[PDB]
From Swiss-Prot, chain A:
The lineage of its organism: Viruses, Riboviria, Orthornavirae, Pisuviricota, Pisoniviricetes. It comes from Severe acute respiratory syndrome coronavirus 2. Precursor of the fusion protein processed in the biosynthesis of the S protein and the formation of virus particle. Mediates fusion of the virion and cellular membranes by functioning as a class I viral fusion protein. Contains two viral fusion peptides that are unmasked after cleavage. The S2/S2' cleavage occurs during virus entry at the cell membrane by host TMPRSS2 or during endocytosis by host CSTL. The record marks 21-22 as: Cleavage. This is Spike protein S2. Residues 22-43 are annotated as: Fusion peptide 1. Glycans are attached at residue 7.
Amino acid sequence: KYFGGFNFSQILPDPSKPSKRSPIEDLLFNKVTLADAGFIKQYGDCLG
Amino acid sequence: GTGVLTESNKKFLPFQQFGRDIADTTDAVRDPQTLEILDITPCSFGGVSV
Ligand SMILES: *[C@@H]1O[C@H](CO)[C@@H](O[C@@H]2O[C@H](CO)[C@@H](O)[C@H](O)[C@H]2NC(C)=O)[C@H](O)[C@H]1NC(C)=O
Ligand SMILES: *[C@@H]1O[C@H](CO)[C@@H](O)[C@H](O)[C@H]1NC(C)=O
């Protein structure tokens, strides 16, 4: 990951997270997903 | 109406008799004979694609 001293760790995907997303992307995902509602898939899973 | 009737954990007041949703349609009801809070959910549906 050496790039002549430039550091791209923040934008490069992070293998540590289960989702292969950069640290920047994780901040974006959490901050805006407020009204994303439930991902229960609207099956019988959400009884109520 | 037609739907799937399930036991509801949503408590009712002793005077409460039926529960209604945002759309002003009955979603939870109390059985007349045996007083239990029953949830009402419409039967599953969806679009079909070929
Ligand atoms: C590139 O930047 C990252 C973060 O911007 C640096 O990672 C930090 O490393 C130190 C020491 O290893 C830790 O104490 C910090 O917690 C780390 N930051 C984060 C956000 O995890 C990294 O050292 C920089 N340089 C290289 C070569 O990656
Ligand atoms: C109706 O349900 C059974 C059948 O008699 C009985 O236990 C109950 O007392 C009856 N009356 C009422 C008001 O539920």
